[PDB]
């Protein structure tokens, strides 16, 4: 631990003071499952992203986000955002969590071909309200494909 | 160990599927060196060919078997998902077996009854509260027990059978499974005779991709091609009718004169003659016929010949080639249309790349951060795995609509930027 | 290199006529029509070879006796009894005949296998002579468009 | 030519009301505007 993060009582030797578990001049690997933290940091990232996206033009908050960029850079792959029409007849963002065993199954394999064929069939045939039903059926079928591909 | 083996075959379906093809190419490359005296083999002084054939014939049947097992493990659950899903939605939102009771047509509907009575009907669909919903929604208007009677290393000792008859009836109607069954059947027949392995060269179509886009040009208008061939047969029938009435004597296809006569005096011989040497001559029918040098019916025969030419050889063959060529053009125009639509419009809203491209890179943010298909898929993937107790207000407002199929929560003609234009808003 | 070899033999200068493609402009736009879909053309030729292989398989099993390309009768027999001769026969006088394969073959006047041979001939015609050649010409024409 | 004709009629009856000649932009502002204009308000059949 020399290259990744710097060397202070609060950065590197902090972990060594935390790591005084064994007695044989060695150290285990349960430190990482003990430290757990990203379950909290994700919600913090969602909070700060919500505040930035909804209340821009506040330099007080940009000063804050410039302190937290090392965390937001971690949680950008895992962080979603869509837009729905809420109960209040107003558009609303919806922040939520994305796994890794979904991003590593929607990306590389044949499901891109499935998406391409879906878009082809939709935008040729088409319809009024037999569009989003097709998209949702595609999403359901694709979800079962990804789940079964995880079962290995 | 069984489950690990089945997961190995399912994970390695396409690789074995491609391996059978190279096996068949090898077999049919060896078959080029066949001979007779009875169908022996004579190599170019190398006796290592018979045993290679004898082992490859076995490998092909084995790999066909493993490909069938891969198809049963991998892709069958998805078609079963689709059937169970459509059945459940027909029950809830349309009321099929309660009110409609479908025709003897729609044989899917007649076959898809004896899954209803069973325990593990929603084995794959992941919606277990189906039967409860139908008991709730029709428990009184039609019946309560009338509904319930309608609905309800030691591995190989207890399992349902009412479900696994419907399941097999589904998969044996599945097209690709039947294709792989034909594959295995021909490889099994490959040992009775080692020429039946030639039929497994037709898997290049399903295997390669661009070859399928070649053959789509023919498949796009196969109906029109077939009816054109029918028109051809009818026209040739009229021409032979005319010939059988009047021009019988020209059709002496014998040798030099003062010889026995081989002639088309009937109708069923003249018709096969015309359809066999009349279109398949490049010039028509006059090429294969005695010449009318000084007959009373000369100009009529000349008209018969050149009209055969200008209606069968030119026109209808041109119709065939034109159907192919228009197929190519149609498919290309389709793909250009999808590019134009997905470059001019958001898939979800239908707004335009003019409200957004006001700002730099607006549309390439709308379709990459805000309104992505994938982030609208992962939301469902989140909601499903989540429990109905941990839902927030937004997730519950959405989950009430998903399981009752409204779709108003998707935007349409509106967006976050249209709502909150930064205008004291 | 070819101009240097032109002195060993003064026919190797013929190969420098192929520079008209790189030289002229509109000729390159001609030949782009073929180059646009050369992959598809090549795979079409592969399909053709496979189909002819199936047809000669059928012929080698059943229709061996019609393929006497000798002179008049009571003569020695020049025949396609093997498979590797029948395949080159079909790919050399079967597509390159304008009519198919029945043109270059003894006629089935009164055989038990008559209608099967007629089917073999006209299906060869309507699948090789018409269809696949039309696919070739269509790939060119779609290239122009 | 015949194929292009049919594509033209699909484009016209998806981009315009037959009666007015307005556009599917005034209406699609609202959800399902054009598919109400050509199904409840300005139908050929209700004018017949
Ligand atoms: Zn959008
Ligand atoms: Zn109108």
From Swiss-Prot, chain B:
Tissue specificity, per the record, is:
Highly expressed in heart, lung, cerebellum and brain. Detected at lower levels in adrenal gland, stomach, thymus, esophagus and ovary.
* Result of altering residue 283 to A: No effect on calcium channel activity. Abolishes ryanodine binding
When this gene is knocked out, what is seen? Embryonically lethal. Embryos die at about 10 dpc, due to defects in heart tube development. Cardiac myotubes display enlarged rough endoplasmic reticulum and cytoplasmic vesicles that contain high levels of Ca(2+).
Intramembrane segments as residue ranges: 278-287
Which residues point to the Cytoplasmic side?
329-425
Out of the domains of life, which is the source?
A: Eukaryota
Q: What is the effect of changing residue 282 to A?
A: Reduced calcium channel activity. Reduces single channel conductance by 97%. No effect on ryaodine binding
Known post-translational modifications? Channel activity is modulated by phosphorylation. Phosphorylation is increased in failing heart, leading to calcium leaks and increased cytoplasmic Ca(2+) levels.
- Give TM regions: 18-37, 61-81, 188-208, 227-247, 308-328
Q: Which family does it belong to?
A: Belongs to the ryanodine receptor (TC 1.A.3.1) family. RYR2 subfamily.
Record's function text: Cytosolic calcium-activated calcium channel that mediates the release of Ca(2+) from the sarcoplasmic reticulum into the cytosol and thereby plays a key role in triggering cardiac muscle contraction. Aberrant channel activation can lead to cardiac arrhythmia. In cardiac myocytes, calcium release is triggered by increased Ca(2+) cytosolic levels due to activation of the L-type calcium channel CACNA1C. The calcium channel activity is modulated by formation of heterotetramers with RYR3. Required for cellular calcium ion homeostasis. Required for embryonic heart development.
How does the record describe its quaternary structure? Answer: Homotetramer. Can also form heterotetramers with RYR1 and RYR3. Interacts with CALM and S100A1; these interactions regulate channel activity. Identified in a complex composed of RYR2, FKBP1B, PKA catalytic subunit, PRKAR2A, AKAP6, and the protein phosphatases PP2A and PP1. Interacts directly with FKBP1B, PKA, PP1 and PP2A. Interacts with FKBP1A and FKBP1B; these interactions may stabilize the channel in its closed state and prevent Ca(2+) leaks. Interacts with SELENON. Identified in a complex, composed of FSD2, CMYA5 and RYR2.
Protein name as it appears in the record:
Ryanodine receptor 2
